[PDB]
């Protein structure tokens with residue numbers, strides 16, 4: 425992957441590699457997404473969940489959210505990829521976190537990017553001001569947060585107002601990944617991915633982690649691709665048995681458009697090649713990513 429990396433680089437062919445991926449990627453219907461009744465539940469016209477893998481709300485009313493379950497069979501890990509909640513779907517979002525039993529939410533975007541409102545403000549920014557979403561009958565409180573220079577971990581309490589059951593959700597917000605961009609470095613990305621992992625939220629005792637950006641494909645696909653490649657590498661301890669592009673193709677069976685530019689692809693080879701030093705038995709690099717990243 426490291427030789428492929430250098431071959432690709434030497435002969436300036438990331439875009440064509442990426443172009444091939446786009447050409448190979450699956451195509452499956454998104455008919456419920458396109459129901460007229462769901463128009464205002466989608467942020468982008470051109471980014472939909474395929475019907476086969478979409479997440480259904482457990483409501484009789486309208487079961488539609490723009491979210492997909494990415495179920496990586498071999499790696500044995502799933503994620504739910506979703507767009508940034510809209511002003512009218514923040515209640516659907518948290519209904520889905522409750523129903524799917526997720527323990528973590530990864531947000532890879534800011535509420536504002538390039539002058540636009542990429543995502544509703546769907547979690548509370550302070551302890552005294554909880555949010556209640558009447559439509560799905562759920563309450564959410566900030567329990568605390570831990571703000572780093574490039575990301576923040578929130579502990580959130582989610583309450584199902586109908587049964588009064590309560591869960592803790594962890595929110596990992598990467599706030600320095602530009603839309604249609606890459607992270608500043610592999611170090612700070614792996615730093616952030618490993619915070620997520622250490623937290624327990626990836627563990628198969630939970631529902632699938634919710635990963636989102638603005639559309640739920642570019643930055644998310646990047647995160648997820650790196651995570652699974654490292655996972656696959658780990659259950660074998662065998663870096664050479666991972667085919668990154670092929671894994672991306674597996675993921676795009678479950679949601680379109682995963683990874684939005686050829687520099688995102690290239691960044692994902694960089695992140696997995698670096699992270700393999702850790703999977704391969706050198707845990708001191710984790711500490712190094714933490715220094716490089718400048719977390720504090």
Ligand SMILES: O=C(O)C(=O)Nc1sc2c(c1C(=O)O)CCOC2
Nearest residue numbers: 468604637638639640641642643684
């Ligand atoms: O948030 C991302 O990482 C992401 O995939 N963004 C997406 S993918 C995508 C758009 C954007 C965007 O935010 O403007 C606009 C519509 O076309 C595809």
